[model samples]
Target: VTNQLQYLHKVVMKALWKHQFAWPFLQPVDAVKLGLPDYHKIIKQPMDMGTIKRRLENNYYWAASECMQDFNTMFTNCYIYNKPTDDIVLMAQTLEKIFLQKVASMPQE
Candidate 1:
């Protein structure tokens, strides 16, 4: 059961990474480069796809819920940083929907 859950986690994560709207979330935000010095201040918990992937491989997540939190954080951070109707927010909305669908398709014990 654990193996199956991990496999499904990888599947969903990889699918999200390949999504068209995944560009902005593929990696951590560069506060310095983007000149958003207050980003860290606003988002206490910064998350990104690459970090989640690494954490997944490192066995950092003990349950699917943990992984879910990271994905939520990644998008939530973007939502907080950008305007409600901003392009990034829109992309995050779609990507989050895709993520949810994939996660829901997984079988659970």
Candidate 2:
């Protein structure tokens, strides 16, 4: 319903992530804001083979994260596979902690 969700809804995220998207990444600050630090460095570096490789990796990771980040399910692995018509409800009080653990793990070139 919200405008941000209009472009960034789950369906759209899944679809875009399914197909490789050439994101016109903006400023380093912007990439940081989106939580992908590797991309900022890639944007700073001049285009080359390594840069191409890094961008592709970032692109795929971006899509995967966007598509797979689910806050609704409980500590369950995947109930949606069998319970397609069921509503997934998780305990709401647990502290949901997430981390962007790797821009550092990405290639240094």
Candidate 3:
């Protein structure tokens, strides 16, 4: 059983490394790389959600991305406009929960 477990672990690691979408993300070189993985792999297997979450978090570029600028401004403006109210913080937390739940439920492909 121990040997079997070790074998399974090796297999899983190989699969993860060979995974076209995930390998590049796992490997950190001097340059930037971005792309999605093969849709069929996602559809066929159960994902390691923790790894996926970490990968997404690492790749997130809210400050650098143009699309997130408006959101950043809105949050910053709210923080400035509302000095005493904790509503902004609460709203941010609520939005985070919603976003996490949505991501958790999404099909990998």
- lDDT to native, each model: 0.83, 0.29, 0.35
Per-candidate TM-scores read 0.90, 0.17, 0.26
- What TM-score quantifies how close candidate 3 is to the native fold? 0.26
Residues 68-89, model 2: lDDT tens digits: 2332222122232224443321
Candidate 1 regions with alpha-carbon error over 4 angstroms: none
Clashing pairs for predicted structure model 3, backbone only: none
lDDT of 1 by residue, 1-109 (tens): 2663586456788888888889888889999998988999999999999998888878887777777888899989999888787899899999898888887777674
Per-candidate Cα RMSD to the true structure, in Å, reads 1.7, 17.7, 18.4
- Top lDDT: which candidate number? 1
What is the Cα-based lDDT of residue 20 in candidate 2? Answer: 23
lDDT of 3 by residue, 27-107 (tens): 221122323244333233222323433433464422222212322333343344334565545554444344334334333
C-alpha lDDT of residue 1 in model 3: 22
Steric clash pairs (candidate 2): none
Tell me model 3's lDDT, rounded to 2 decimals: 0.35
